[PDB]
Amino acid sequence: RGSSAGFDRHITIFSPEGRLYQVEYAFKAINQGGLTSVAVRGKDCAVIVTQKKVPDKLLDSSTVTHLFKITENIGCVMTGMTADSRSQVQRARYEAANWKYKYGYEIPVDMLCKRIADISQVYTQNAEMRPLGCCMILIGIDEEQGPQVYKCDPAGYYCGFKATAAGVKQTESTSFLEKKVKKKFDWTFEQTVETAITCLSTVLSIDFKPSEIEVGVVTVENPKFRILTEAEIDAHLVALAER
Amino acid sequence: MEYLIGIQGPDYVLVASDRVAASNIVQMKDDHDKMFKMSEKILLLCVGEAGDTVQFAEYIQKNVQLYKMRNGYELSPTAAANFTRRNLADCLRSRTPYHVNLLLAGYDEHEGPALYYMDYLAALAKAPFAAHGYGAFLTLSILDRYYTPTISRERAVELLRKCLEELQKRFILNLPTFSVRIIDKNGIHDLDNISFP
Amino acid sequence: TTIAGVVYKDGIVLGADTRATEGMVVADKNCSKIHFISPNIYCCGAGTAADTDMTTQLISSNLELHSLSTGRLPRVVTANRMLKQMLFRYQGYIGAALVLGGVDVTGPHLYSIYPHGSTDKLPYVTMGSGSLAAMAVFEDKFRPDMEEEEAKNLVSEAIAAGIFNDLGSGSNIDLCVISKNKLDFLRPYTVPNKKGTRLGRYRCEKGTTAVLTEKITPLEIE
Amino acid sequence: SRRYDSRTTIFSPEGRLYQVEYAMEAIGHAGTCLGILANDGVLLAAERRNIHKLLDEVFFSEKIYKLNEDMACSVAGITSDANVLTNELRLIAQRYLLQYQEPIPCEQLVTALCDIKQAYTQFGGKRPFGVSLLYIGWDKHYGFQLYQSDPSGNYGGWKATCIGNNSAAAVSMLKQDYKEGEMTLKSALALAIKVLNKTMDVSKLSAEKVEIATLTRENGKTVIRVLKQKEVEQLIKKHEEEEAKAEREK
Amino acid sequence: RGYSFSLTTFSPSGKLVQIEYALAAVAGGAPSVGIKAANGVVLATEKKQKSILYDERSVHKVEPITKHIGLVYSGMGPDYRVLVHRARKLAQQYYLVYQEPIPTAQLVQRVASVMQEYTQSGGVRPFGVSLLICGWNEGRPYLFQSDPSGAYFAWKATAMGKNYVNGKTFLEKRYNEDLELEDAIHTAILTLKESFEGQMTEDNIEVGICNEAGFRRLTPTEVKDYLAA
Amino acid sequence: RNQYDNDVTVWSPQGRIHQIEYAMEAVKQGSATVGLKSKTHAVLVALKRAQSELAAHQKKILHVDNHIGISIAGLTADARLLCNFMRQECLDSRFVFDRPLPVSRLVSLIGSKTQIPTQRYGRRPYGVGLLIAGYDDMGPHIFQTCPSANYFDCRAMSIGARSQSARTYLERHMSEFMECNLNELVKHGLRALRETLPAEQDLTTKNVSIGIVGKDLEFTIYDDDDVSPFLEGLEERP
Amino acid sequence: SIMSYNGGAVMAMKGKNCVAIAADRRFGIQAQMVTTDFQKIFPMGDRLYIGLAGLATDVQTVAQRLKFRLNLYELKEGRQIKPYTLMSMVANLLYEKRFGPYYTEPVIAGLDPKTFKPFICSLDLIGCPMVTDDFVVSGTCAEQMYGMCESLWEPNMDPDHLFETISQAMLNAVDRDAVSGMGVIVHIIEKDKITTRTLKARMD
Amino acid sequence: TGYDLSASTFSPDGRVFQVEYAMKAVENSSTAIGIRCKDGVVFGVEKLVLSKLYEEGSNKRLFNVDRHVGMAVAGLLADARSLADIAREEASNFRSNFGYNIPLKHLADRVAMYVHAYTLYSAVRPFGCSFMLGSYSVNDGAQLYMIDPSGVSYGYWGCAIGKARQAAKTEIEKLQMKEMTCRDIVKEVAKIIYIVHDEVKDKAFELELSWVGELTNGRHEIVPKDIREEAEKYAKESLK
Amino acid sequence: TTIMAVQFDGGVVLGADSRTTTGSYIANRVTDKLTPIHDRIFCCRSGSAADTQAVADAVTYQLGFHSIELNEPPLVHTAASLFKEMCYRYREDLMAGIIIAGWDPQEGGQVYSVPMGGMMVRQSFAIGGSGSSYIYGYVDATYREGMTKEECLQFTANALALAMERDGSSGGVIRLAAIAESGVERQVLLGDQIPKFAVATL
Secondary structure, three states, X not given: OOOOOOOOOOOOOOOOOOOOHHHHHHHHHHHHOOOEEEEEEOOOEEEEEEEOOOOOOOEOOOOOOOEEOOOOXXXXXXXXXXXXXXXXXXXXXXXXXXXXXXXXXXXXXXXXXXXXXXXXXXXXXXXXXXXXXXXXXXXXXXXXXXXXXXXXXXXXXXXXXXXXXXXXXXXXXXXXXXXXXXXXXXXXXXXXXXXXXXXXXXXXXXXXXXXXXXXXXXXXXXXXXXXXXXXXXXXXXXXHXXX | OOOEEEEEOOOOEEEEEEOOEEOOOOXXXXXXXXXXXXXXXXXXXXXXXXXXXXXXXXXXXXXXXXXXXXXXXXXXXXXXXXXXXXXXXXXXXXXXXXXXXXXXXXXXXXXXXXXXXXXXXXXXXXXXXXXXXXHHHHHHHHHHHHOOOOOOHHHHHHHHXXXXXXXXXXXXXXXXXXXXXXXXXXXXXXXXXXXXX | OEEEEEEEOOEEEEEEOOOEEEOOEEEEOXXXXXXXXXXXXXXXXXXXXXXXXXXXXXXXXXXXXHHHHHOOOOOHHHHHXXXXXXXXXXXXXXXXXXXXXXXXXXXXXXXXXXXXXXXXXXXXXXXXXXXXXXXXXXXXXXXXXXXXXXXXXXXXXXXXXHHOOOOOOOOOEEEEEEEOOOEEEEXXXXXXXXXXXXXXXXXXXXXXXXXXXXXXXXXXXX | OOOOOOOOOOOOOOOOOHHHHHHHHHHHHOOOEEXXXXXXXXXXXXXXXXXXXXXXXXOOOOOOOEEEOOEEOOEEEOHHHHHHHHHHHHHHHHHHHHHHOOOOOHHHHHHHHHHHHHHHHHOOOXXXXXXXXXXEEEEOOOEEEEEEEOOOOOEEEOOEEEEOOOHHXXXXXXXXXXXXXXXXXXXXXXXXXXHHHHHOOOOOOOOOOEEEEEEEEEOOEEEEEEOOHHHXXXXXXXXXXXXXXXXXXX | OOOOOEOOOEOOOOOEHHHHHHHHHHHOOOOEEEEEOOXXXXXXXXXXXXXXXXXXXXXXXXXXXXXXXXXXXXXXXXXXXXXXXXXXXXXXXXXXXXXXXXXXXXXXXXXXXXXXXXXXXXXXXXXXXXXXXXXXXXXXXXXXXXXXXXXXXXXXEEEEOOOHHHHHHHHHHHOOOOOOHHHHHHHHHHHHHHHXXXXXXXXXXXXXXXXXXXXXXXXXXXXXXXXXX | OOOOOOOOOOOOOOOOOXXXXXXXXXXXXXXXXXXXXXXXXEEEEEEOOXXXXXXXXXOOEEEEEOOEEEEOOEOHHHHHHHHHHHHHHHHHHHHHHOOOOOHHHHHHHHHHHHHOHHHEOOOOOOOEOEEEEEEOOOOEEEEEEOOOOOEEEEOEEEEOOOHHHHXXXXXXXXXXXXXXXXXXXXXXXXXHHHHHOOOOOOOOOOOEEEEEEEOOOOOEEEOOOOOHHHHHOOOOOO | OOHHHOOOEEEEEEEOOEEEEEEEOOEEOOOOEEEOOOOOEEEOOOOEEXXXXXXXXXXXXXXXXXXXXXXXXXXXXXXXXXXXXXXXXXHHHHHHOOOOOOOEOOEXXXXXXXXXXXXXXXXXXXXXXXXXXXXXXXXXXHHHHXXXXXXXXXXXXXXXXXXXXXXXXXXXXXXXXXXXXXXXXXXXXXXXXXXEEEEOOOOO | OHHHOOOOOOOOOOOOHXXXXXXXXXXXXXXXXXXXXXXXXXXXXXXXXXXXXXXXXXXXXXXXXXXXXXXXXXXXXXXXXHHHHHHHHHHHHHHHHHOOOOOHHHHHHHHHXXXXXXXXXXXXXXXXXXXXXXXXXXXXXXXXXXEOOOOOEEEEOEEEEOOOHHHXXXXXXXXXXXXXXXXXXXXXXXXXXXXXXXOOOOOXXXXXXXXXXXXXXXXXXXXXXXHXXXXXXXXXHHHO | OEEEEEEEOOEEEEEEOXXXXXXXXXXXXXXXXXXXXXXXXXXXXXXXXXXXXXXXXXXXXXXXXXXXXXXXXXXXXXHHHHHHHHHHHOOOOOOEEEEEEEEEOOOEEEEEEEOOOOOXXXXXXXXXXXXXXXHHHHHHHHOOOOOOHHHHHHHHHHHHHHHHHHOOOOOOOEEEEEEEOOOEEEEEEOHHHOOOOOOOOO
């Protein structure tokens, strides 16, 4: 099946089957980072959780973080190559501000993820430049739609999700989540946070402490993106462990 | 200042020009040639601001002879006229406007003789007779009087001499001698220069 | 030219005359000074007519792109910002004075745009030659939260004042009513002035005119 | 980057351009096409390769691609490159008309396009235009004309020719059958049907398979007319009758 | 800046192997189908999602270019989105110039010109998608297919993606020119059902129609109503 | 094997760029030269190679400005290119600020211009090694340049073929050079350069060129005629 | 008045299943005539005509550019252009030169090819479309022929009455201005045929 | 593998091997450390002296990219100087536009993105240098950021780059910089460098030190020679 | 028009009229010249309305991008510097006079004045527009160090009313704003709310 001809593996051109082997290798590069992130939307809130693995004590834990603030009402979590991630969030910030300047209102997350995916497309189409080895997950509140969660990939797939996972444990995490959403739930704020943390803790076997993870939220009551402090995270965790 | 005149007929085009090149009060030259041949059977007459005339004329001459060498057959007078009109019209908007007043003349085996007129604004027109310069105001009424589409070439030369002698008597500038040449199926023919001592 | 707009309770009413003048002679007696930007956004134009028409067409295009890309209806602030940025880029040389009106999710929004790129969000605006008379009518009789019929009558009275007191404007009144749910484009909403009947018949019989040539060419049809 | 480059615009040790050689080979696979000059007119004829039943007919012709009042061009090879070249041709002709206010000569049009094709051969590092296309038209200088073009950027004037599949067999048939200076449009149509029947793999020309267009001068205004299915049906019927009469004789 | 040499080049056989391979990716694409009725034209495709977690309403494989044109694809989605964006820009350029809605024929000509521009241009791969374009102009319906090569064909009805050969055989068996779009929708849904490999529902597929009114993608409710048959 | 070497933008698996090393090897083949300084004076001494007996020897030492002079090694075309660049930099300095350009800032510019090509495709390092010498308000300076754009600051240095003998001689005698007269300093440098020569060859007026700069003395190149006084008192080969 | 440099006048009128378009013949400098055979009406279709007045060089240039674009359109589409479409194309063409404009004021007149419905329009210096149901004008004697047409014109006229009307209007108008005249040509368009007639007019 | 010859490629296991090969180079360079403390930040370098000929201050591996921020590098010194030029340009443009001294976080981000541009395209190689930036502002405080050739930027309480990165990190880890101040920190910085220096493999070194903090009024500068000598003496004596 | 700003301890006060004129005709009698560049940073606008709106939007764009990438609240000096470079680079084209005021933690309440020509000056109190001429004396006399929020608001209202009665271009309703750590308190004085001063009334 997996035949190869010419420079199909070395650059972004079609294999005899049309697979574009390179973008698949870029997908492997996401798991090369070694971390995992999970997203889930409720009726009134959306969240993103991810590991916070500090290899050295000397590193400032404040600086290292995969959660970023694209706008006041948008936040994202990046997984993969840290450098390409920072490039993508900078480009997203640019596109958001330019959208505001041109069209006069805050960009929707769907349009943002579509713009980012088109950008990644021009990478995977042109041979000069490699695809960025990162995947973005965006959360935001749309006034009409409600809470929203979208994920981008190096290829350009930009779908919208009720819940998502990204990283090395993506398949296990989505297997976990597919069972939960298959069952009916109210999906309140505390329930969403508990679901996300449980998914991460179950796939990793970590049994997290407060510093071990980071989390960000958006609520219809408080649409601004907020990265919860260690106190709030520990408050949620102690609640989880008790029940 | 410079004077051009053209008379179409059944089987020929007659053209004339003054041979004066003047910068100012003085007359520098008395044998200036304002007639440029773009091919064997078409002529271009150009007058206006100095330099623009020869530059534009030589450009058109180059393009026409190039067409001939490339394709093996000469342009028709109509095609040459529209070509020079295009090149002139493109430029009036540009930073390099050519202020030139033109009069084209040619013979086509199929379409017969032709005379075209275009001002510095590059407005083309096909006319039976036409003239340029301040002298045109004097001489056009002569042609409108004594011109017939069936005019023979001897009668045409006679009519020309009438126009030019009227210029000599009535026009302030000194245009002593005029170049003359005829276009027909055989080709361009130079004639005895009309002079007034 | 006299264009005017007003916000009523649940939408917008735009109004305009139909007289287009080249100099001081009438050229078009039933012009359409009301343009389509979007299904929910409309605009009326004054000033250089070509500039207004082409600008409105351009912004209509860009908003068509934006709307069908987003999957949701376009907003008014978007149009206002596009227009003002364009007009500022050209620094007033394109003489498009516009009153722009539309209804979107946030509510009815009405803008007045000037050639140099200025804007003003207002409840009522008037532009053109009869703008002062229309402003007089509005400053007199405008009240907030009017009903649709009251707003239509007000705008009609304003455009009529501009008509019967300005030389440039005349010949008809056009109306457009945008709301959350409908759009009523009323081209001959009113006919205040009409051409009087011709008393004398001056129809010329055949052969009245001489002809020196005639050439008939048949057109094949199938 | 030197590693990922094909290096198309280079010579070969034998002195060849392998890319245009291969483009000619691709044209060898394309649907066959031919054009036949006559004293009174010229006609293009093609094998409509897209013969599927579900295909609609929303175009004037599948391949004929009119360029101007006085000329047209059938096609062999990649339809995409063909469409691009036809657009370029139309632009060229209308540019000449804008300049001189006379219709363009066919030789000049073909020369312009062939120069464009040659440029892709020589520089740019781009692939050539893998298209060979006939041209037919009328100019006052030389009258009815037929021209052939190749991806190499070289053209020729032919009295009758074929491009595409089995062009060699078509030409072998045309050499013997074509009568120099002794042809009319009807006889040329018959010869076209003959060589199409000989060259095409179809047992019989259904009149869906073929597409024919003619060029003629009527009242000082040239006309480019695609022949209708009834006309070509009558033609193939006449050809079958003639073939039977020849066979019945012997 | 960028590579300036063609990545697609002629094989000794004469075939553009990159184009053949792009067509292979299209063949591996999801099913899609189009049927041109007398009164209208229908475009349909399956929207099979890997998991229930995905939101169906988020993304649409059926996208409208204008009021009266909409198209669907089989193959690479990002490439499809590049193409649909550029097509919208082209159609609105036409509208700015002519103040008349673009004919679908000219649209597909232009986008095919683009798709040609990519295969010939340097430092790029061909678009790995084929499109089905539907339109209603001059009170007539249209259906077109644009391949990666940049070649446009016109069909009364056709299919794309997996099992397109069997789908086209079935469609040639079941197609009538006199059909109304009401029955055409049933035939298209049946064609997709031939290769759906599942229990298709309102979420599992996407469909759109074009008519005198214009192009619209049917909501899941009426899609379910049609699926009842 | 040929991989990792054909291009400059390719890091080797051992964390090296072979093309830069090769350009440095180009300098290691070139004609030998010496640079040394004292409290007040800076000297540049050169062996000028001759392609044949009849050929005149190559111009190793160049003028850049009154207060700066260079001695080249390796590709003379790259050398003349860099020298034109440096001349333009110093001329721009005098045009703008009406001051002599400092040597340190000049070599900073040189390193920048030399670093840009070695990080891009389809460009080569400047396969040249230089010794800079000048006098500024600070004092005499000697800077070495390599195709690798890194530069150095040194009391003495020698680059070219068989330069290592000169380097060890200079390392041995570095102590005295700081406090020396001009004649003593140039004689030290000449002995150092003499070490680089083959045992058969010997220094001559023809094959030697000297460039000297100082507080009052502008940069002056002493050709074969006027180089004889400096080497007049030199000892014989041991 | 740069428009008055060459003068000229063009007019169009509507009727029942018919349109008429007319224009003067004079080509002249600001006071000097040159030719009485100038083409200001150019055919843009089988039964669609455009008429240009203003600076003659811009008249010719615009007609040539328009024929260029139009032939490309007719070749690409495969159909004849509609009048509204030609109007829009002309407006785009003129607005492309909005700074440094073509000094001409076009007039288009024709029938829709499918329904044979009359269409007339005019465009300003810079491409302001102006569709009307009765008549349109462009030229120096516009002010004259406006009132002349306002009086003579009547709705749903047949071709005969249309010809007599447009002829009387053009003659009595151009007789009253200096820089236009020297004859006038009248093209009548209807579904079955095209009719062109020149009128006897004062050559003064 | 054929996947290692350009940075526009990817390994089948997801790695761009050119970047890894690049950071091998900085790992083959003499080590440098920077240690943040309450008062400010201190930098230190093991500048191997290649020859007795080279003058004191040659191959300076400590730059001042702006007055309020310092720099300390490893790897290819040419690329280091180039990035110092880039950083100075970024700081100057920031001051010119926004009117104040650039924050070190933004500076490190901009520099890292400029680095990261190079590892994507094939026309350009990755940088061969990893480097530490350090600054002190009264509002922002002491701040230290280390950058790698991959373009990844992280803040550090103490950072090390070069061959002896690991042992340096250990010796820093036992330090407890948070309570300390600069005048104390310089001494054990010297200690750590003298430790990790290999007398056998590395012939000799010249300690290059730089600091910034409130003591300098937010002005990065090289250590006065008196303190440099005192710290070197303490280090050698403690070394035993 | 008349625009005015005053710095009090812990914040600032902004005041401006609501009149914009084209000649002697008032196109808009309720225009809002106070513009939020950011949550705690505001801009008053004098001169060409087009120029001021344009540069305000561009500065808002740049400053939002800068603030979000820094992840810290922006500075009034920064916004004023942006306005400065824009107005200085385009001093020939732009006829615009700006006064910027906001609150930031580092420096607190700040007022900067960017007149025509693109120079930037921090000021305790700064007035602009056609009507500032008529009230230079009133502010010079009335100002005192240590004024409070309500005191500064009344000061600004009196000044703007005095300018409005005399200047034809200035007029309408007074729009006021007060910016501090807490947030923005905007209010509009109209009719009798506006302070009144007795005419000569001979």
